Amino acid sequence: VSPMPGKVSKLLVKSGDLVEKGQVLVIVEAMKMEHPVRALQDGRVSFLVKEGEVVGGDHVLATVAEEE
Amino acid sequence: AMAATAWLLNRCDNWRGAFRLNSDTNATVHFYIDDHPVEVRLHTEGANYHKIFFSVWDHDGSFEVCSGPVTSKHRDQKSIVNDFTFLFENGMHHTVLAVATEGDVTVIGSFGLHQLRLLPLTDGFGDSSTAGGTSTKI
Amino acid sequence: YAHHPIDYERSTSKSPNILRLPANTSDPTYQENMARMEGLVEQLRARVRYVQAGGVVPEEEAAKAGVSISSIEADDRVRKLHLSRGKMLARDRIERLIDPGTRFLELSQLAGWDLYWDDKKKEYERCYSGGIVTGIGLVNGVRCMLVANDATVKGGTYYPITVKKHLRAQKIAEQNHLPCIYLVDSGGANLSRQDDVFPDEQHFGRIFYNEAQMSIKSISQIAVVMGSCTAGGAYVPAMADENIIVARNGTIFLGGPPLVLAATGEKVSSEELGGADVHCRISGVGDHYATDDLHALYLARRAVANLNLKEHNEARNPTDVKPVPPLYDPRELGGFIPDMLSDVVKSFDVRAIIARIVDGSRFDEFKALYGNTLVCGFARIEGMQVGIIANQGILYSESALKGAHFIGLCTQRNVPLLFLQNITGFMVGKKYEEGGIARNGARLVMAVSSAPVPKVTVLIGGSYGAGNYGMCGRAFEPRFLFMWPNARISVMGGTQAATVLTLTNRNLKNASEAEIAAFKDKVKKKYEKEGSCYYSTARLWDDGVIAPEDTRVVVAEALRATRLAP
Amino acid sequence: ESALKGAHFIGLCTQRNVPLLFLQNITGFMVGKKYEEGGIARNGARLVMAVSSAPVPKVTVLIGGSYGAGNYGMCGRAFEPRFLFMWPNARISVMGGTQAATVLTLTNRNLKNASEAEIAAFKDKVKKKYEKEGSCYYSTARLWDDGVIAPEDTRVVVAEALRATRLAP
Amino acid sequence: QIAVVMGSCTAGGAYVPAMADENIIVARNGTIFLGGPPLVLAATGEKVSSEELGGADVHCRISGVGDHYATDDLHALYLARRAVANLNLKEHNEARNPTDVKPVPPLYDPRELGGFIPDMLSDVVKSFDVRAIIARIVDGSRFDEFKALYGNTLVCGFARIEGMQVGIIANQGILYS
Amino acid sequence: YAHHPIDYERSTSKSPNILRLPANTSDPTYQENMARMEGLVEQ
Ligand SMILES: O=CCCCC[C@@H]1SC[C@@H]2NC(=O)N[C@@H]21
Numbered sequence A: 001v002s003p004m005p006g007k008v009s010k011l012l013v014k015s016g017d018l019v020e021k022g023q024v025l026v027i028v029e030a031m032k033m034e035h036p037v038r039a040l041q042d043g044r045v046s047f048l049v050k051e052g053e054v055v056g057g058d059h060v061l062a063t064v065a066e067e068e
Numbered sequence B: 001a002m003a004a005t006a007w008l009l010n011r012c013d014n015w016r017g018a019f020r021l022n023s024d025t026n027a028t029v030h031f032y033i034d035d036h037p038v039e040v041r042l043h044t045e046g047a048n049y050h051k052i053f054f055s056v057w058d059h060d061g062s063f064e065v066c067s068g069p070v071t072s073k074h075r076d077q078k079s080i081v082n083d084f085t086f087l088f089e090n091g092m093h094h095t096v097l098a099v100a101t102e103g104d105v106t107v108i109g110s111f112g113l114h115q116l117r118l119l120p121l122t123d124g125f126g127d128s129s130t131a132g133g134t135s136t137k138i
Numbered sequence C: 001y002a003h004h005p006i007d008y009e010r011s012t013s014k015s016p017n018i019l020r021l022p023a024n025t026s027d028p029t030y031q032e033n034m035a036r037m038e039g040l041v042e043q044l045r046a047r048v049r050y051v052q053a054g055g056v057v058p059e060e061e062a063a064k065a066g067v068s069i070s071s072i073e074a075d076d077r078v079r080k081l082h083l084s085r086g087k088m089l090a091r092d093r094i095e096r097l098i099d100p101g102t103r104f105l106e107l108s109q110l111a112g113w114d115l116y117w118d119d120k121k122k123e124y125e126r127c128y129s130g131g132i133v134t135g136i137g138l139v140n141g142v143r144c145m146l147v148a149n150d151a152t153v154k155g156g157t158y159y160p161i162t163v164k165k166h167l168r169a170q171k172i173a174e175q176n177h178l179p180c181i182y183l184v185d186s187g188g189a190n191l192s193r194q195d196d197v198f199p200d201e202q203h204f205g206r207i208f209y210n211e212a213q214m215s216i217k218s219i220s221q222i223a224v225v226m227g228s229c230t231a232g233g234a235y236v237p238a239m240a241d242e243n244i245i246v247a248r249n250g251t252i253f254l255g256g257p258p259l260v261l262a263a264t265g266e267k268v269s270s271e272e273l274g275g276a277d278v279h280c281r282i283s284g285v286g287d288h289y290a291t292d293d294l295h296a297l298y299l300a301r302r303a304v305a306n307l308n309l310k311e312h313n314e315a316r317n318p319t320d321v322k323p324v325p326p327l328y329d330p331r332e333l334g335g336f337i338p339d340m341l342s343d344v345v346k347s348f349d350v351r352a353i354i355a356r357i358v359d360g361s362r363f364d365e366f367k368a369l370y371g372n373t374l375v376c377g378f379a380r381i382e383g384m385q386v387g388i389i390a391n392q393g394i395l396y397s398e399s400a401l402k403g404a405h406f407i408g409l410c411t412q413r414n415v416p417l418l419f420l421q422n423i424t425g426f427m428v429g430k431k432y433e434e435g436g437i438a439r440n441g442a443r444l445v446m447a448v449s450s451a452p453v454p455k456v457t458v459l460i461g462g463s464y465g466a467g468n469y470g471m472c473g474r475a476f477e478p479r480f481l482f483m484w485p486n487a488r489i490s491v492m493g494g495t496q497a498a499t500v501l502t503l504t505n506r507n508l509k510n511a512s513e514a515e516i517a518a519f520k521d522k523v524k525k526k527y528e529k530e531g532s533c534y535y536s537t538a539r540l541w542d543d544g545v546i547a548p549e550d551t552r553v554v555v556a557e558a559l560r561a562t563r564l565a566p
Numbered sequence D: 001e002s003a004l005k006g007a008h009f010i011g012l013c014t015q016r017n018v019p020l021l022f023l024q025n026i027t028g029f030m031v032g033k034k035y036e037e038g039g040i041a042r043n044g045a046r047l048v049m050a051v052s053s054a055p056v057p058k059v060t061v062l063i064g065g066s067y068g069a070g071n072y073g074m075c076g077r078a079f080e081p082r083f084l085f086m087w088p089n090a091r092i093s094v095m096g097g098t099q100a101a102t103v104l105t106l107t108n109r110n111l112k113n114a115s116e117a118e119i120a121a122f123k124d125k126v127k128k129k130y131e132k133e134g135s136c137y138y139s140t141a142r143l144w145d146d147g148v149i150a151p152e153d154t155r156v157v158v159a160e161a162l163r164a165t166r167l168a169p
Numbered sequence E: 001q002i003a004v005v006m007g008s009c010t011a012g013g014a015y016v017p018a019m020a021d022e023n024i025i026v027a028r029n030g031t032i033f034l035g036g037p038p039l040v041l042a043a044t045g046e047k048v049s050s051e052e053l054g055g056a057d058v059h060c061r062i063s064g065v066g067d068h069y070a071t072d073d074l075h076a077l078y079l080a081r082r083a084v085a086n087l088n089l090k091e092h093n094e095a096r097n098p099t100d101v102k103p104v105p106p107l108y109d110p111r112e113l114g115g116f117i118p119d120m121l122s123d124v125v126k127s128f129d130v131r132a133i134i135a136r137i138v139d140g141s142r143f144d145e146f147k148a149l150y151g152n153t154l155v156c157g158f159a160r161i162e163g164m165q166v167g168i169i170a171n172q173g174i175l176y177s
Numbered sequence F: 001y002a003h004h005p006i007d008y009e010r011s012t013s014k015s016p017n018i019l020r021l022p023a024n025t026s027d028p029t030y031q032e033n034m035a036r037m038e039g040l041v042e043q
């Protein structure tokens, strides 16, 4: 989930691809704060947002679920 | 090159654990071959003790060197007798059993046997007075 | 559930979770970063060479260093004249003095780099070093501090950067109980900046204060008098357990040879005025009278031998150890470092750096799910257990709590600490301020300052503002400081200060473009005019400057330096 | 001999835990060759060693004319004085207040001729430099000898200082 | 000191995880509570999941409680061992107690210790001995007697027990002054 | 000046100035002294 400022962009992960190592799933910018999330939850990650879309605080940017 | 290297290693940890800042190492040996002093300079580039170079008689090259077990810690008159391996860049390789002492370095291998005398540098280190001593003595 | 080991296997195997497996893929991003780093080290590694053998660089291809062209012939002439005298003009005295096959540090280097601006607008004072060279040296099995006065007297013996370097060396030696060796060659004083160097405190008197406080604590010190030490410089030979005066060119004076003239000017030979007087004079001044440079250095070594510190150092630091290298190649350290001059902060990682530096590429994480911003845990550095604080992101209250807890444990069990500085990163949100963030920051700083554990910090990059107060800073007694090339030490904001100070400075609403040209560009120039290369080290702010690739060796030197301590 | 007497006094004062007061003056190191041959440097070191080693609380007040390295013999800011105070007629300068002018006149790129213009450019200039500093500006304003007082009310100030230094451990 | 929280520790039992240099909470069944799940009922009984009431909450909650979150029993035990490792006591114990020692056995078989012990439930006290017991227990079957002719009732002297010098007081008879 | 060792050799050799080389010549003077000493120890 990203903080209030949102403005997600430059997502470098493909939807529905396994993420065991903690790569930068999404990078959100808050006052020049890239603050990459770097999730380490295993399983494929499904994106519900698009680059350049301003999102609210603690929004569900993606659901990191076990590969089923 | 092999004779000079053996005297250091077969005496101490020269080139072992050595480290400087934003620079590179250097250590030199003086040989008194015949009646003419001979200087050999050895240095390293990178983080490699292995990669070593040389410049004697205006001839430069590279080689690597792998030693053997360390022996003769007491370093007496017999000093240290160890086998050495040298991989020069051209492609060769050599094995040298070097019994080195302060007086000389002896290298035996397929080349044959050669003993190189180390340039002597001793002269009453301390009592070196050239004062005239003109008057007011005893 | 079908799992019943005995902890090992799970442990003592090449598959323990303790290690780290960040393997890079050398992509453009890597290249962009890796390449820049390379672009950030070549000259660092180079200027060193130029100041070394300062002003005499026969290659004349030193364009990789932005240093201005200097009259090489004048420096070569001076060096020839000095070496004709019979004394070695170089740092040669040092590597002659230290045992072969041993290590060295060169504590402060590039000191006084292009510091003073002369009357000539395009000319700076040519202080290739601070006038001295300082490094930790291991003599005869004894670890010692080495301070050597360079023969550069063209500008004057000592500057506000020279006495500070000497005093930093003395404080380090006293803290660490390493005996000092001073190589003394002076032109007296500097009668131009004398108000800046003589009076007040932390000046030339504090050298004399320290040389007595050390001998109170029975930390023997040694000085070698190669040339004249006048103008209060003659007290160090007098205040010394052992002192060496060279037979011909070693001189010590409280009053100069010109000074006898105009006040009972019965001038006589400079030998009789206080120089090396080997004629069995009544004065019992100066322990050793040596005929040659090698003789003097040899007697210095011999005196160093009879101190009984060899047993204590050998017991405390094991001489015969098996080096354990990390699992990943240390050349990769430049790659994970991002680029520079990027409008918005780039991304960064820490795991990779610690996995590249530590032994066996391992780590001992405390709570990482919680306060995900800050990183703390144990490690191993060449046979010694270490604690590391490396910063990543914008600090929270919980990060400060975790830091305080870690420092508490480390002080409790006597574990050294390592610091890897980063951005300030204090959130300004109103809810965070209402949540008592100031109290938690105080909680952190209190523990940081109160810790009796030895502390070393190294700049990763982007250390700007009051955030360093949370982790560590020069004003918090770090026994050593070292720096990487991509470092900026500035106000509470590196980039934001520009935006904030744009608003509140006598600006009309109109002329917006000319104003941002005059405001934002100017403040950017001010806040990145300072950098690792100039504002630091040259002014003995974070005196040590290193390469990112060779950090573990340096930190291991530091830790061996801080175990002779009481 | 003055240095020996000073060392002996400081030894007694440290032995019996008696506070010390300093009243600074000129440097006054003789430059005679016989004095240098008599081990004067050793005796100066004897004095400075005792000065710095003393755990006794120490306060100094400038009488006047404290210029040069002589203060190292008595006391100085770099020797941890728990307080410093100053009188108006104070000058803190190089090893020579007046002689530095004469000595530095000789050894500075001077032609033999143009003597009057040279002494106007050398001696007057160095006098201006070495008395441009004074009690009022170079000191206190820069927290060199932070306290500035009147000569008439010195005992009250020193009594404040001594009462300040008896809560000490 | 180190504590591992395998299950619930309520009713003042939750302070040990709080008062601990290192503490371990298992991912699923590790729970810590100051107030019980029944306790929320009858006092603002808005009951919610036992996870949210104080159990193992691996969701990056605001609470910085509990150092280690381990997915399995073996993982938790392994992290406990790893934390125990970083205490620096290994050097001190190894120096104080020599790890590599040569065992010196007694001269007589230790199975005989039951024999010199008399029987039980005997109207009058039976007879007893000590020398045999000490000779069977100590190293090399030896002893260092002090005065034994005098105050023949009580026994005192030095000995050796597996490389360490020991003093033994063994009682035999009716005590005198 | 054509002298560049590393302190040892100058040290760790059988030729360091640290040692002492007073070798006696056993002359009458030596005998007079040596003999007396012998005359001062026997009993
Ligand atoms: O949106 C939240 C980001 C807050 C960042 C605050 C830090 S404090 C120092 C620096 N100067 C700023 O204006 N922002 C950062």
Ligand SMILES: O=CCCCC[C@@H]1SC[C@@H]2NC(=O)N[C@@H]21
Pocket (backbone or CB within 6 Å): C255, C263, C264, D027, D028, D029, D030, D031, D095, D096, D097, D098, D099, D100
């Ligand atoms: O009687 C003649 C001797 C004069 C000594 C003058 C002293 S020496 C040190 C100090 N520096 C000066 O310029 N004058 C005094």
